[model samples]
Target: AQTVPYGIPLIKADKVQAQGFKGANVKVAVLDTGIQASHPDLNVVGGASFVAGEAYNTDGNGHGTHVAGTVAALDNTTGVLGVAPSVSLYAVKVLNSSGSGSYSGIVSGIEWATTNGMDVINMSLGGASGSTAMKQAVDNAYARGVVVVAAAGNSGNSGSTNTIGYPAKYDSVIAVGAVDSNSNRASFSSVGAELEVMAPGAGVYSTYPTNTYATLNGTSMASPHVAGAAALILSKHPNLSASQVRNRLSSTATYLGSSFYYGKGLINVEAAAQ
Candidate 1:
């Protein structure tokens, strides 16, 4: 049997994995630092690098690798399993090793992924204020029939105020927030009416570079889970419109708290495809 991460069972993704629907052939673009193509637990079909010296297939920061694993780390006996083990992963290296990239780089990555026949795009990086080009890029991707999921940013407070970042706050994107295993919102999880759903982010474990795994915390970690869920949904309902996919995700979510904090709540793949 393959060892699976805690998040796989937490979001009930394990049940979907048991259903023999492993996001088969669904193309996902991971827009971040990069994914280690050689990571044993994860699979990289191919990708493009916008960063100067970094290779799209190699991970220098490990953030993209970690996030990518949560989306589709293979179900093998040697290591952990991801939400959708059979989905195709494409690394769009927008951020550098230091986890920083310009908006233009991100826009270019979005344009590349959309034009390349990618079904879903996951952006775990964001900015305080969204650039006009960035919004246009996301909008274009959405119009092109691609599902775009992004981190809601890790800038939350005790009070109920809007701290969500751009792109994520946009109408075309599905903004995801962070939550613990107990369905409690992460203190650092940005909130607002724009925040879409919650996922396991605190102390989440997944793949890393050099053939290893690590635990991380961020809305970044939560976004890929949703992206993986999108893959599962697409795998089952290939003809389902992107708007329908978004509606399915929201309606099937498990309610945790107020809409302002948890949005539609944590996503459930089994329920999403059922």
Candidate 2:
């Protein structure tokens, strides 16, 4: 039996899937830890590794593969399918085995994605410290027509305090927050005025390395949901620019709570695709 993950349906991706728009022809770069290139559920068409001695084809940390899965696993009978299963997946490994990477590493990955003609860049990373060069890198990527989506960080609490992190906090990037299956904002999903949209991040299940699947949480998982949705939107409306893609998803999303926590609210992929 084919098991589509709850997160995908939560965002109403199934409705779009039925219309035969499976994110075909969209180039999506997963800039994080490496992905398991051999995983049958995923197709890693190409990649470049910034992590020393670590192959871009392998996921030593498993986080990148999970994120990649959410973006475009496969439309197979077994294993889960991603939101944008037909999008071309490229592994831009910026983080290392411990799921940790520096701002400089991420910036290089961003440069590679833009220069190499990637349509979408899914960066599920957030750091408290900000960088000037990194901001411009993302800004340039956005200007170059790459739909940049990133985690809003997981430093949230009871009250709002502008906890969104770097690169994601930038104007050109789409800062994503976490929401549960019930549409409640995840407490750990950092909130701020910049948080652009929400997705199912709590207990999100996706592909892992070594032909396995795992459930992981964080705004990190929420980000690829948007990334895959972006790919779908891009596939349908190839002419939409990065800003247009960002605005389309945000404006069409299902409004939930406050903008500080949910921005425009949860993304409705079916609505955005049309």
Candidate 3:
């Protein structure tokens, strides 16, 4: 029940110390709820809305705002802070006011983001069913040199049988599952063959709607951590190809728990940057 902490702006004041990231010129396109581009901490780049056609990417449901804040919220004395500060964000509002989007809407959003030359695209959402259109769109982004990361859905009870969500569960997409602070898989994390890596998802803190903050827990929260971690990796090795970065993330993951629940292991941002 915590959004990512957005107190610190998306600058590299802290990461430069912890990780050797010198701040790279990276753009992460979010195909979820909209964000507060005018939040003083956020810089509103040109964005689009496939849900409402001409809808704004503001924090109507508060989820997108929180996720966006986690992706690139300014690291000033605001409320909470994101994993990556100095990166840029493209708000692609695909989900509607209810925090849900259609397969067509998501596909269009992904297409638009890819067309805009986005370095990375984060889908903090996933449907139980995999649509052909959605798979094509995700695969298209991967082929077009965009690192696509998505939530692995919230249906896994950490049991042997786990439900894999589309896009995340797809072979081309980077399927991200949820993990707690202690490196344990979240009970509600969706699991399967498509899981590429795991990141901090339980009890995360970030931005909310109406100029406030809140706590939201889910693999959705974990997806942005992967996004931020991707930014960190890109900052260090800017020349690394999309596949290289993806492989590094998967290989460098801190092995924890069994594959039944944990994917490649816990996402070690520090290790991945190194």
Candidate 4:
């Protein structure tokens, strides 16, 4: 494995590339603020915008770019590498510049990805409540063989269980929690029955807008690690159903920390790749 200025420890600890899978031929759609299409390290194949007046190719808020980079930045020397560097990324811009968007917009993006043959969809943004329409959209995507991954939320307290956020709390989506470099649950990561997996989130290093790099923290950051891991599973197995993919991930995860805080456990990409 190669060394990255950041995120490499998480990847190395997980051994994501130990089996040499790089998410080739996998199509991952990032439903968020958008992406910096021209970022040299990112393989942004194309995108669509549900946000009014915003181009899907441009990431004005920078949040989507960071999310995209976590999934498939590139397998190169210039920038940080991702968990699935060879996956083809498509930005499904549901959120606006403020990192907020309507439920309708999110539903629209999910619908589009389902119809368009996206193998996996990573949603790093969420709300407090789940809507029936959003649940329907996620179910439709799952029924169509698309794996949906999302952040649990950033509302956890030291001893309190923070409610998992919408879209993520949906049964069809994999709700991801956050962990720090030491593999402890992040202080701000949400905890709930819906939480399915954990990944490094604190000070996670990835690409930002304008060809820069940044370290961010949130369940938002943790979600993409599982998304990238899902791509690796699809890249190697290619025949697993959406549910099968979810099972493989959860079953192979390295069980650690609190079940409420870490779900099944920290995602081990190499273990799932097998």
Model 3 lDDT, full chain set: 0.75
The residue-by-residue lDDT of candidate 3 on 52-119, one tens digit each, is 64465575787788777767766667676667767888899989988888889899988998899888
Off by over 4 Å in 3: 1-23
RMSD in order of candidates: 1.0, 0.9, 3.4, 1.9
- The per-prediction tally of clashing pairs is 0, 0, 31, 0
- For model 2, what is the error of residue 52's alpha carbon versus the real structure, in angstroms, after optimal superposition? 0.7
By lDDT, the candidates rank as: 2, 1, 4, 3
For candidate 1, lDDT tens digit of each residue in 167-232?
799999999999987878989999998999998889888888888988999999999999999998
Error of 2 at 146 (Å): 0.7
lDDT (10s digit) by residue, model 4, range 1-274: 3336344446442365656778888999999999999988897898799999999999999999999998987886788888888998999999999999998999999999998899999999989987888999999899999999999999985566558998889999999998888888888888887889998888888889998888889999999988988998888899999999999889888898667877999887677767
Better model by lDDT: candidate 1 vs candidate 4 = 1
Give the TM-score of each candidate. 0.98, 0.98, 0.90, 0.95
The deviation in Å at residue 100 for candidate 4 is 0.5
1 or 3, greater by TM-score: 1
Which stretch of 10 consecutive residues in model 3 shows the poorest summed lDDT? 4-13
- Candidate 2 wrong stretches, greater than 4 Å: none
Candidate 4 regions off by >4 Å?
A: 1-18, 158-162
